[PDB]
Design a protein around this ligand. Structure first.
Ligand SMILES: CC(=O)N[C@@H]1[C@@H](O[C@@H]2O[C@H](CO)[C@@H](O)[C@H](O)[C@H]2NC(C)=O)[C@@H](O)[C@@H](CO)O[C@H]1O
Ligand SMILES: *[C@@H]1O[C@H](CO)[C@@H](O[C@@H]2O[C@H](CO)[C@@H](O)[C@H](O)[C@H]2NC(C)=O)[C@H](O)[C@H]1NC(C)=O
Ligand SMILES: O=c1ccn([C@@H]2O[C@H](COP(=O)(O)OP(=O)(O)O)[C@@H](O)[C@H]2O)c(=O)[nH]1
Ligand SMILES: *[C@@H]1O[C@H](CO[C@H]2O[C@@H](C)[C@@H](O)[C@@H](O)[C@@H]2O)[C@@H](O)[C@H](O)[C@H]1NC(C)=O
Ligand SMILES: C[C@@H](O)[C@H](N)C(=O)O
Ligand SMILES: [Mn+2]
Length: 267
Protein backbone atom coordinates (compact mmCIF):
# COMPACT_ATOMS: atom_id res chain seq x y z
CA UNK A 1 0.00 0.00 0.00
CA UNK A 2 3.04 2.20 -0.44
CA UNK A 3 3.10 3.01 3.32
CA UNK A 4 6.37 4.70 4.32
CA UNK A 5 5.55 4.34 8.04
CA UNK A 6 3.36 1.79 9.83
CA UNK A 7 2.53 1.44 13.59
CA UNK A 8 3.67 -1.68 15.45
CA UNK A 9 0.34 -3.22 16.36
CA UNK A 10 -1.47 -6.51 15.80
CA UNK A 11 -5.23 -5.95 15.66
CA UNK A 12 -5.61 -9.69 14.91
CA UNK A 13 -4.02 -10.58 18.30
CA UNK A 14 -5.76 -7.84 20.33
CA UNK A 15 -8.57 -6.19 18.35
CA UNK A 16 -8.76 -2.60 19.61
CA UNK A 17 -12.14 -1.34 20.61
CA UNK A 18 -11.52 2.26 19.48
CA UNK A 19 -8.82 3.49 17.07
CA UNK A 20 -8.14 7.25 16.94
CA UNK A 21 -6.75 8.59 13.64
CA UNK A 22 -5.47 12.14 14.17
CA UNK A 23 -4.85 14.58 11.28
CA UNK A 24 -1.98 17.05 11.84
CA UNK A 25 0.58 18.74 9.59
CA UNK A 26 4.32 18.08 9.99
CA UNK A 27 4.89 21.32 11.90
CA UNK A 28 2.20 20.59 14.57
CA UNK A 29 4.43 18.57 16.89
CA UNK A 30 3.12 20.60 19.84
CA UNK A 31 -0.43 19.42 19.01
CA UNK A 32 0.60 15.80 18.74
CA UNK A 33 2.47 15.89 22.05
CA UNK A 34 -0.45 17.52 23.84
CA UNK A 35 -2.70 14.72 22.44
CA UNK A 36 -0.22 11.99 23.40
CA UNK A 37 -0.25 13.42 26.95
CA UNK A 38 -4.09 13.75 27.07
CA UNK A 39 -6.98 11.96 25.27
CA UNK A 40 -4.61 10.17 22.86
CA UNK A 41 -2.94 8.22 25.72
CA UNK A 42 -3.40 4.52 25.04
CA UNK A 43 -5.14 2.60 27.81
CA UNK A 44 -8.01 0.28 28.58
CA UNK A 45 -11.28 2.25 28.90
CA UNK A 46 -13.82 0.12 30.81
CA UNK A 47 -11.74 -2.86 29.75
CA UNK A 48 -11.72 -1.85 26.04
CA UNK A 49 -8.51 -1.09 24.19
CA UNK A 50 -7.87 2.44 22.89
CA UNK A 51 -5.19 2.98 20.23
CA UNK A 52 -3.97 6.32 18.79
CA UNK A 53 -2.16 7.06 15.52
CA UNK A 54 -1.23 10.27 13.65
CA UNK A 55 -1.78 10.60 9.90
CA UNK A 56 0.98 12.35 7.99
CA UNK A 57 2.03 12.70 4.37
CA UNK A 58 5.36 14.05 3.13
CA UNK A 59 6.86 17.50 2.77
CA UNK A 60 9.63 18.98 0.67
CA UNK A 61 11.28 20.48 3.79
CA UNK A 62 14.29 18.35 4.70
CA UNK A 63 14.16 19.62 8.30
CA UNK A 64 10.54 18.62 8.84
CA UNK A 65 11.26 15.32 7.13
CA UNK A 66 14.04 14.49 9.57
CA UNK A 67 12.09 15.61 12.67
CA UNK A 68 9.11 13.48 11.66
CA UNK A 69 11.45 10.55 11.02
CA UNK A 70 12.78 10.93 14.58
CA UNK A 71 9.22 11.29 15.93
CA UNK A 72 8.14 7.97 14.27
CA UNK A 73 11.27 6.31 15.70
CA UNK A 74 10.60 7.60 19.25
CA UNK A 75 6.76 7.07 19.34
CA UNK A 76 5.97 4.42 16.66
CA UNK A 77 2.43 5.82 16.19
CA UNK A 78 2.62 7.52 12.76
CA UNK A 79 0.84 6.29 9.60
CA UNK A 80 2.57 7.83 6.54
CA UNK A 81 2.30 7.61 2.74
CA UNK A 82 4.16 9.66 0.11
CA UNK A 83 1.78 12.52 -0.62
CA UNK A 84 2.35 16.26 -0.30
CA UNK A 85 0.85 17.01 3.15
CA UNK A 86 -1.13 20.21 2.35
CA UNK A 87 -4.67 21.51 3.20
CA UNK A 88 -6.01 20.54 -0.30
CA UNK A 89 -4.57 16.96 0.11
CA UNK A 90 -6.61 16.23 3.30
CA UNK A 91 -8.84 13.86 1.26
CA UNK A 92 -5.70 11.72 0.50
CA UNK A 93 -4.75 11.79 4.22
CA UNK A 94 -8.20 10.60 5.33
CA UNK A 95 -8.24 7.89 2.64
CA UNK A 96 -4.73 6.83 3.93
CA UNK A 97 -6.21 6.27 7.44
CA UNK A 98 -9.23 4.38 6.05
CA UNK A 99 -6.85 2.31 3.87
CA UNK A 100 -4.75 1.56 7.00
CA UNK A 101 -7.80 0.31 8.93
CA UNK A 102 -8.80 -1.84 5.93
CA UNK A 103 -5.35 -3.40 5.33
CA UNK A 104 -4.00 -3.65 8.93
CA UNK A 105 -6.85 -3.24 11.45
CA UNK A 106 -10.16 -4.47 9.98
CA UNK A 107 -10.84 -5.91 13.45
CA UNK A 108 -11.32 -2.43 15.07
CA UNK A 109 -14.83 -2.23 16.46
CA UNK A 110 -14.84 1.56 16.08
CA UNK A 111 -12.65 4.21 14.43
CA UNK A 112 -12.68 7.97 15.06
CA UNK A 113 -11.07 10.34 12.53
CA UNK A 114 -10.22 13.61 14.34
CA UNK A 115 -8.43 16.92 13.93
CA UNK A 116 -5.62 18.11 16.23
CA UNK A 117 -7.29 21.27 17.72
CA UNK A 118 -9.76 19.10 19.57
CA UNK A 119 -10.79 17.76 22.97
CA UNK A 120 -12.08 14.11 22.87
CA UNK A 121 -13.81 12.38 25.82
CA UNK A 122 -13.08 8.70 24.96
CA UNK A 123 -14.64 7.59 28.29
CA UNK A 124 -18.06 9.08 27.43
CA UNK A 125 -17.74 8.06 23.73
CA UNK A 126 -16.98 4.45 24.78
CA UNK A 127 -20.03 4.51 27.08
CA UNK A 128 -22.41 5.83 24.37
CA UNK A 129 -21.01 3.32 21.79
CA UNK A 130 -21.54 0.31 24.15
CA UNK A 131 -25.18 1.51 24.46
CA UNK A 132 -25.86 2.17 20.73
CA UNK A 133 -25.98 -1.60 19.94
CA UNK A 134 -24.84 -0.38 16.43
CA UNK A 135 -21.79 -2.50 15.40
CA UNK A 136 -22.01 -2.52 11.55
CA UNK A 137 -22.64 0.15 8.87
CA UNK A 138 -22.46 2.73 11.73
CA UNK A 139 -21.37 6.36 11.13
CA UNK A 140 -21.88 9.30 13.46
CA UNK A 141 -20.63 12.75 14.53
CA UNK A 142 -21.96 16.29 14.03
CA UNK A 143 -24.43 15.63 11.23
CA UNK A 144 -24.42 18.19 8.36
CA UNK A 145 -27.57 17.37 6.32
CA UNK A 146 -28.53 20.10 3.79
CA UNK A 147 -25.20 21.82 3.24
CA UNK A 148 -24.58 24.12 0.30
CA UNK A 149 -21.09 24.29 -1.23
CA UNK A 150 -19.24 27.50 -0.34
CA UNK A 151 -18.82 29.55 -3.53
CA UNK A 152 -17.18 32.59 -1.75
CA UNK A 153 -13.80 32.48 -3.71
CA UNK A 154 -11.42 33.35 -0.85
CA UNK A 155 -13.17 31.12 1.76
CA UNK A 156 -11.09 28.30 3.29
CA UNK A 157 -13.76 25.82 2.15
CA UNK A 158 -14.30 27.35 -1.30
CA UNK A 159 -15.04 24.90 -4.13
CA UNK A 160 -15.60 26.01 -7.70
CA UNK A 161 -18.43 24.71 -9.80
CA UNK A 162 -15.85 22.59 -11.66
CA UNK A 163 -14.62 21.03 -8.42
CA UNK A 164 -18.18 20.36 -7.24
CA UNK A 165 -20.90 21.17 -9.80
CA UNK A 166 -24.07 20.53 -7.76
CA UNK A 167 -26.21 22.84 -5.51
CA UNK A 168 -26.08 20.72 -2.34
CA UNK A 169 -23.60 18.31 -0.70
CA UNK A 170 -24.61 14.79 0.30
CA UNK A 171 -25.19 14.17 4.01
CA UNK A 172 -21.90 14.20 5.88
CA UNK A 173 -20.37 14.75 9.31
CA UNK A 174 -17.94 17.49 10.43
CA UNK A 175 -14.32 16.42 9.74
CA UNK A 176 -13.49 17.85 13.20
CA UNK A 177 -14.28 14.38 14.54
CA UNK A 178 -16.42 11.51 13.32
CA UNK A 179 -16.81 7.86 14.30
CA UNK A 180 -17.59 4.72 12.31
CA UNK A 181 -17.75 0.95 12.72
CA UNK A 182 -14.43 -0.58 11.50
CA UNK A 183 -16.24 -2.47 8.66
CA UNK A 184 -17.18 0.92 7.07
CA UNK A 185 -13.43 1.52 6.37
CA UNK A 186 -13.26 -1.45 3.98
CA UNK A 187 -16.47 -0.41 2.20
CA UNK A 188 -15.38 3.25 1.78
CA UNK A 189 -11.92 2.19 0.52
CA UNK A 190 -13.60 -0.17 -1.98
CA UNK A 191 -15.97 2.44 -3.46
CA UNK A 192 -13.55 5.42 -3.12
CA UNK A 193 -12.09 5.29 -6.67
CA UNK A 194 -15.63 5.22 -8.20
CA UNK A 195 -16.82 8.39 -6.36
CA UNK A 196 -16.34 11.96 -7.70
CA UNK A 197 -13.29 13.34 -5.91
CA UNK A 198 -13.63 16.43 -3.77
CA UNK A 199 -10.83 18.18 -1.81
CA UNK A 200 -12.99 18.51 1.34
CA UNK A 201 -12.34 15.11 3.12
CA UNK A 202 -15.57 15.03 5.19
CA UNK A 203 -17.70 15.72 2.07
CA UNK A 204 -15.85 12.98 0.12
CA UNK A 205 -16.50 10.39 2.87
CA UNK A 206 -20.15 11.54 2.74
CA UNK A 207 -20.17 10.85 -1.01
CA UNK A 208 -18.79 7.34 -0.35
CA UNK A 209 -21.31 6.63 2.45
CA UNK A 210 -24.19 7.72 0.14
CA UNK A 211 -22.91 5.46 -2.62
CA UNK A 212 -22.84 2.65 -0.02
CA UNK A 213 -26.36 3.40 1.28
CA UNK A 214 -24.95 3.95 4.79
CA UNK A 215 -27.22 6.37 6.63
CA UNK A 216 -25.83 8.84 9.21
CA UNK A 217 -27.07 8.48 12.78
CA UNK A 218 -27.00 10.74 15.84
CA UNK A 219 -24.89 9.08 18.56
CA UNK A 220 -27.16 10.15 21.45
CA UNK A 221 -30.36 12.00 22.29
CA UNK A 222 -28.27 15.00 23.26
CA UNK A 223 -25.58 16.81 21.12
CA UNK A 224 -22.11 15.34 21.83
CA UNK A 225 -20.06 16.74 18.90
CA UNK A 226 -19.29 20.50 18.92
CA UNK A 227 -17.48 21.75 15.74
CA UNK A 228 -18.38 25.30 16.91
CA UNK A 229 -16.54 24.96 20.22
CA UNK A 230 -17.89 25.42 23.74
CA UNK A 231 -17.61 27.42 26.98
CA UNK A 232 -15.53 25.09 29.21
CA UNK A 233 -16.92 23.50 32.39
CA UNK A 234 -15.82 20.23 34.04
CA UNK A 235 -19.43 19.02 34.22
CA UNK A 236 -20.12 19.89 30.55
CA UNK A 237 -16.89 18.23 29.31
CA UNK A 238 -17.78 15.05 31.28
CA UNK A 239 -20.98 14.71 29.17
CA UNK A 240 -19.62 15.41 25.63
CA UNK A 241 -17.52 13.45 23.07
CA UNK A 242 -15.76 16.18 21.05
CA UNK A 243 -15.07 19.92 21.14
CA UNK A 244 -13.18 21.93 18.47
CA UNK A 245 -11.22 25.24 18.66
CA UNK A 246 -8.87 23.95 21.38
CA UNK A 247 -5.18 24.89 21.18
CA UNK A 248 -2.45 22.72 22.81
CA UNK A 249 -1.93 24.79 25.95
CA UNK A 250 -5.70 24.92 26.38
CA UNK A 251 -6.04 21.13 25.88
CA UNK A 252 -3.47 20.37 28.64
CA UNK A 253 -5.24 22.83 31.01
CA UNK A 254 -8.65 21.20 30.37
CA UNK A 255 -7.20 17.69 30.90
CA UNK A 256 -5.66 18.88 34.20
CA UNK A 257 -9.04 20.36 35.24
CA UNK A 258 -10.76 17.00 34.63
CA UNK A 259 -8.03 15.16 36.62
CA UNK A 260 -8.12 17.78 39.42
CA UNK A 261 -11.88 17.33 39.78
CA UNK A 262 -12.12 13.57 39.15
CA UNK A 263 -14.25 12.10 41.94
CA UNK A 264 -16.34 15.17 42.49
CA UNK A 265 -20.02 14.89 41.66
CA UNK A 266 -21.93 16.81 39.01
CA UNK A 267 -25.58 17.97 38.82
C1 LIG B 1 -17.06 25.99 11.85
C2 LIG B 1 -18.23 25.57 11.02
O1 LIG B 1 -19.13 24.88 11.49
N1 LIG B 1 -18.23 25.97 9.75
C3 LIG B 1 -19.35 25.87 8.83
C4 LIG B 1 -19.05 24.99 7.63
O2 LIG B 1 -18.57 23.72 8.01
C5 LIG B 1 -17.56 23.36 7.13
O3 LIG B 1 -18.14 22.95 5.90
C6 LIG B 1 -17.17 22.46 4.96
C7 LIG B 1 -17.92 22.24 3.67
O4 LIG B 1 -18.38 23.48 3.18
C8 LIG B 1 -16.53 21.21 5.56
O5 LIG B 1 -15.61 20.63 4.65
C9 LIG B 1 -15.79 21.63 6.82
O6 LIG B 1 -15.12 20.54 7.42
C10 LIG B 1 -16.76 22.25 7.81
N2 LIG B 1 -16.08 22.79 8.97
C11 LIG B 1 -16.22 22.31 10.20
C12 LIG B 1 -15.38 22.98 11.25
O7 LIG B 1 -16.97 21.38 10.47
C13 LIG B 1 -20.28 24.91 6.73
O8 LIG B 1 -21.37 24.36 7.46
C14 LIG B 1 -20.70 26.31 6.29
C15 LIG B 1 -21.98 26.38 5.51
O9 LIG B 1 -22.36 27.74 5.38
O10 LIG B 1 -20.92 27.10 7.47
C16 LIG B 1 -19.70 27.20 8.17
O11 LIG B 1 -19.65 28.32 9.01
C1 LIG C 1 -1.08 16.10 -3.29
O1 LIG C 1 0.02 15.21 -3.24
C2 LIG C 1 0.38 14.75 -4.55
C3 LIG C 1 1.41 13.67 -4.36
O2 LIG C 1 2.51 14.15 -3.62
C4 LIG C 1 0.88 15.95 -5.35
O3 LIG C 1 1.22 15.54 -6.67
C5 LIG C 1 2.55 15.70 -7.02
O4 LIG C 1 2.86 17.08 -7.05
C6 LIG C 1 4.22 17.35 -7.40
C7 LIG C 1 4.41 18.84 -7.28
O5 LIG C 1 5.76 19.18 -7.02
C8 LIG C 1 4.49 16.83 -8.81
O6 LIG C 1 5.86 17.04 -9.13
C9 LIG C 1 4.19 15.35 -8.87
O7 LIG C 1 4.33 14.87 -10.20
C10 LIG C 1 2.78 15.04 -8.38
N1 LIG C 1 2.61 13.61 -8.36
C11 LIG C 1 1.44 12.98 -8.25
C12 LIG C 1 1.47 11.68 -7.52
O8 LIG C 1 0.40 13.45 -8.70
C13 LIG C 1 -0.20 17.00 -5.44
O9 LIG C 1 0.28 18.18 -6.07
C14 LIG C 1 -0.71 17.36 -4.05
N2 LIG C 1 -1.85 18.25 -4.18
C15 LIG C 1 -1.85 19.54 -3.85
C16 LIG C 1 -3.21 20.16 -3.69
O10 LIG C 1 -0.82 20.18 -3.68
O1 LIG D 1 -1.29 20.14 5.70
C1 LIG D 1 -2.11 19.97 6.60
C2 LIG D 1 -3.03 20.95 7.11
C3 LIG D 1 -3.87 20.62 8.10
N1 LIG D 1 -3.89 19.37 8.66
C4 LIG D 1 -4.83 19.02 9.74
O2 LIG D 1 -6.13 18.94 9.20
C5 LIG D 1 -7.09 19.51 10.11
C6 LIG D 1 -7.79 20.67 9.45
O3 LIG D 1 -6.94 21.84 9.53
P1 LIG D 1 -7.56 23.15 10.22
O4 LIG D 1 -7.66 22.91 11.68
O5 LIG D 1 -6.79 24.34 9.78
O6 LIG D 1 -9.01 23.14 9.52
P2 LIG D 1 -10.55 23.55 9.79
O7 LIG D 1 -10.91 23.27 11.21
O8 LIG D 1 -10.64 25.01 9.46
O9 LIG D 1 -11.35 22.71 8.84
C7 LIG D 1 -6.30 19.84 11.39
O10 LIG D 1 -6.36 18.76 12.31
C8 LIG D 1 -4.89 20.06 10.86
O11 LIG D 1 -3.92 19.72 11.82
C9 LIG D 1 -3.05 18.37 8.22
O12 LIG D 1 -3.05 17.25 8.69
N2 LIG D 1 -2.19 18.74 7.21
C1 LIG E 1 -29.06 -1.90 23.75
O1 LIG E 1 -29.31 -3.22 24.19
C2 LIG E 1 -29.44 -3.27 25.62
C3 LIG E 1 -29.34 -4.72 26.03
O2 LIG E 1 -30.59 -5.41 26.06
C4 LIG E 1 -31.35 -5.64 24.95
O3 LIG E 1 -30.74 -6.41 23.92
C5 LIG E 1 -31.40 -6.26 22.64
C6 LIG E 1 -31.08 -7.49 21.83
C7 LIG E 1 -32.90 -6.04 22.85
O4 LIG E 1 -33.62 -6.49 21.71
C8 LIG E 1 -33.38 -6.78 24.10
O5 LIG E 1 -33.17 -8.18 23.96
C9 LIG E 1 -32.67 -6.26 25.33
O6 LIG E 1 -33.47 -5.32 26.03
C10 LIG E 1 -30.73 -2.55 26.00
O7 LIG E 1 -30.88 -2.55 27.41
C11 LIG E 1 -30.65 -1.11 25.50
O8 LIG E 1 -31.88 -0.43 25.70
C12 LIG E 1 -30.31 -1.06 24.02
N1 LIG E 1 -30.14 0.33 23.64
C13 LIG E 1 -30.65 0.89 22.54
C14 LIG E 1 -29.87 2.04 21.99
O9 LIG E 1 -31.69 0.50 22.02
C1 LIG F 1 -18.07 30.21 7.61
C2 LIG F 1 -19.04 29.62 8.61
C3 LIG F 1 -18.46 29.39 10.00
N1 LIG F 1 -19.45 29.74 11.04
C4 LIG F 1 -17.19 30.17 10.19
O1 LIG F 1 -17.18 31.19 10.86
O2 LIG F 1 -16.19 29.72 9.64
MN1 LIG G 1 -9.59 22.72 13.26
Amino acid sequence: GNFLKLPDTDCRQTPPFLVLLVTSSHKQLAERMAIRQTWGKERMVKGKQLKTFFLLGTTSSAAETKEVDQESQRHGDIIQKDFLDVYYNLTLKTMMGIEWVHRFCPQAAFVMKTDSDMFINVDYLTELLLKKNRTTRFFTGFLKLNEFPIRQPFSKWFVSKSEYPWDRYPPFCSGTGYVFSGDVASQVYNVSKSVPYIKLEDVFVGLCLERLNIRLEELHSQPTFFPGGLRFSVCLFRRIVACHFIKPRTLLDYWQALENSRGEDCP
